[PDB]
Amino acid sequence: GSSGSSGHERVGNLNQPIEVTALYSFEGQQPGDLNFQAGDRITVISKTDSHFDWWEGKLRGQTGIFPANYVTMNSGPSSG
């Protein structure tokens, strides 16, 4: 419960996370990674402006890092 030194004071405004669909299955070799399967939607909480990099999302009430190349950005009608 009790905390020491923590906060969210950093550049970048995130009013809401992003939703991505795992294009392929993945198995986090480390405990800090994330475990998902082709189709499982991952809640992107902290990602970068690069597709060739690992992002941080949330799945099945979990959190970990994973390659963005294993997911895709799915959004509704941009014009409609």
Side-chain angles (χ1 to χ4, degrees):
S2 197
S3 75
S5 276
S6 271
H8 202 274
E9 301 169 57
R10 206 192 83 76
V11 178
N13 284 253
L14 210 286
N15 284 246
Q16 75 199 329
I18 325 166
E19 272 176 318
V20 293
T21 308
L23 308 172
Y24 313 100
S25 311
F26 172 79
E27 281 89 35
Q29 302 314 329
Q30 271 160 356
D33 302 341
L34 180 68
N35 310 111
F36 59 97
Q37 294 180 23
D40 272 35
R41 280 271 270 277
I42 304 150
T43 298
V44 180
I45 41 172
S46 207
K47 69 163 272 205
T48 65
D49 271 298
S50 278
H51 299 108
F52 207 92
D53 294 66
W54 288 52
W55 298 338
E56 186 180 36
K58 272 154 82 176
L59 161 76
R60 284 155 169 180
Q62 302 173 357
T63 319
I65 54 156
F66 67 91
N69 166 65
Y70 279 54
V71 305
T72 193
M73 283 184 125
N74 198 89
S75 68
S78 57
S79 194

